[PDB]
A = this chain, B = another copy of it.
Amino acid sequence: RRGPRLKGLRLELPLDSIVKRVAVGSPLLLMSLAFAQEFSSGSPISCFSPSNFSIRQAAYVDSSCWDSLLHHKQDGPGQDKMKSLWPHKALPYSLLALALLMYLPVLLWQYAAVPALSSDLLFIISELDKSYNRSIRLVQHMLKIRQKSSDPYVFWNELEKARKERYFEFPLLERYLACKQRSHSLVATYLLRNSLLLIFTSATYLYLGHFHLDVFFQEEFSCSIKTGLLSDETHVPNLITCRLTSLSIFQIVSLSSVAIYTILVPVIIYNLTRLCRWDKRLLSVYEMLPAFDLLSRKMLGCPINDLNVILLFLRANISELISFSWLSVLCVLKDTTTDTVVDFMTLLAG
Residues of A within 8 A of B (CB): 14-15, 38-41, 46-49, 51-60, 62-64, 67-68, 70-71, 76-77, 89, 93, 111, 115, 119, 122-123, 127, 130, 171-172, 175-176, 178-179, 217, 219-220, 222, 228-230, 235-236, 241-243, 245, 247-248, 251-252, 319-320, 325, 329, 332-333, 335-336, 339, 343-344, 347, 350
Contact present for B243 and A172 (CB under 8 Å): no
Supply 22 A–B pairs (Cβ within 8 Å), ascending by A: A46-B64, A49-B56, A51-B53, A53-B54, A53-B56, A54-B58, A55-B56, A60-B242, A64-B245, A71-B217, A71-B248, A76-B229, A89-B248, A93-B252, A115-B320, A127-B347, A171-B343, A172-B329, A172-B347, A179-B335, A228-B243, A230-B241
Q: Looking at A175, A229, A333, A336, which has the most chain B CB atoms within 10 Å of its CB?
A: A229
Cβ contact of A60, chosen from B15, B48, B123, B228, cutoff 8 A:
B48
Question: Does the CB pair A51–B48 fall under 8 Å?
Answer: no
Rounded to whole angstroms, the CA-CA distance of A252 and B60 in the bound complex is 22
Chain B residues closer than 8 Å to A55, beta-carbon distance: 55-56
Oligomeric state, in copies: 5
Contact A241 B217 (CB under 8 A): no
CA distance A217 to B54 in the complex (A): 27
Rank and list the top 6 A-B pairs by shortest CB-CB distance, nearest first.
A77-B229, A220-B228, A56-B58, A46-B60, A63-B245, A175-B336
Residues from chain B with Cβ under 8 Å of A336 in the complex: 175, 178-179
Contact assessment for A179 and B228 in the assembled complex, using a CB-CB cutoff below 8 Å? no
- Which residues on the B side are within 8 Å of A60 (C-beta)? 46-48, 242-243
Most chain B Cβ neighbours within 10 Å, of A15, A38, A46, A71: A46
Nearest B residue (CB) for A66: B245
**Contact call A71/B123, Cβ cutoff below 8 A:** no
Query: Do B228 and A77 touch across chains, with their CB atoms under 8 A apart?
Result: yes
**A56 nearest in chain B by CB position:** B58
A51: which B residues are within 8 A, CB to CB?
52-54, 57, 235
